[PDB]
Amino acid sequence: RVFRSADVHGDSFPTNMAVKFMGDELSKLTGGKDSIKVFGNSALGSEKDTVDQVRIGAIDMARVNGASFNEIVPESLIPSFPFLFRDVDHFRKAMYGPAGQKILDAFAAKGMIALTFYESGARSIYAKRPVRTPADMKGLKVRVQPSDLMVDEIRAMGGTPTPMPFAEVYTGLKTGLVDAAENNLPSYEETKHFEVAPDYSETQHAMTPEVLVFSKKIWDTLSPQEQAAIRKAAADSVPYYQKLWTAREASAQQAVTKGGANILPAAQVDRAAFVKAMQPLWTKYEKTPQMKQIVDEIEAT
Ligand SMILES: O=C(O)[C@H]1O[C@@H](O)[C@H](O)[C@@H](O)[C@H]1O
Ligand SMILES: [Ca+2]
Ligand SMILES: [Ca+2]
Ligand SMILES: [Cl-]
């Protein structure tokens, strides 16, 4: 049947496109039994709300950021840890390997089947002034996702964190409720945040993944063959997503720069000042030997 899936991004965004592709692939594998419709633009609710809905079986699927599980699935904290991944190649090798699998596995006890990760580049601060160091962060009202870890990350960077839904951030910046936020370049572009917060400073403080989750209540009513079809379609969507995403990182950078944004490259940012300040959070959020082991498996990749 038609599975309903949520996304905060617009229809043309790579996450929406990848799950629509998954849906097309899935309909074939199931002899037309199944397809997916993606409701974008936060139509079904904030990310938080849609995760609640997936967990109770009110919607079938959601494509959400890892941060949105940080208070539900402890293992989801790990890939949001600051400066955990060395670069994108490290993210890919670790997150599509056994370490990433252990993180996906942890979702089942909380009513969700985590089918796949998608990469989300690196999140960086943007604002109305450049940011090279924490002193530069001091005084900024910085929107964060509603995650205790992300609140702590931005506080350690020196900003004053304020949680808000993604859809509300643009107006928050345009009207001065907040002075800053953080995200990857494609999101900075899509939302037009770059028009009102033109200084994008490559702090690259997190490389949090996206996660595609399926309601376990619904999943549990499916046959092993249907389940295997859905898992195959999700896996097959990843190289498709990666083609779109890598192109979008490049096009977003050019578009925001053409549109007046000033990107401060990572090399000019004192990752030094940010790394030593944020590291302790790893120890704070390592809540089990299992989490410690996952972090270790990631680092050893
Ligand atoms: O900051 C946000 O709220 C958003 O960040 C984006 O990178 C992510 O794709 C979204 O799912 C959402 O979490
Ligand atoms: Ca809640
Ligand atoms: Ca360790
Ligand atoms: Cl949201």
UniProtKB/Swiss-Prot annotation:
Transmembrane segments: none annotated. Beta-D-glucuronate binds at H9, E47, R63, R123, N183, E210. GO terms for cellular component: outer membrane-bounded periplasmic space. Pfam families: DctP. Disulfide bonds: none annotated. It is found in: Periplasm. Beta-D-galacturonate binds at H9, E47, R63, R123, N183, E210. Keywords: Periplasm, Signal, Sugar transport, Transport. One of its GO terms (molecular function) is carbohydrate binding. Solute-binding protein that binds D-galacturonate and D-glucuronate (in vitro). Probably part of a tripartite ATP-independent periplasmic (TRAP) transport system that mediates solute transport into the cytoplasm. The complex is comprised of an extracytoplasmic solute-binding protein and a heteromeric permease formed by two transmembrane proteins. Belongs to the bacterial solute-binding protein 7 family. This is Solute-binding protein Bamb_6123. It comes from Burkholderia ambifaria (strain ATCC BAA-244 / DSM 16087 / CCUG 44356 / LMG 19182 / AMMD).
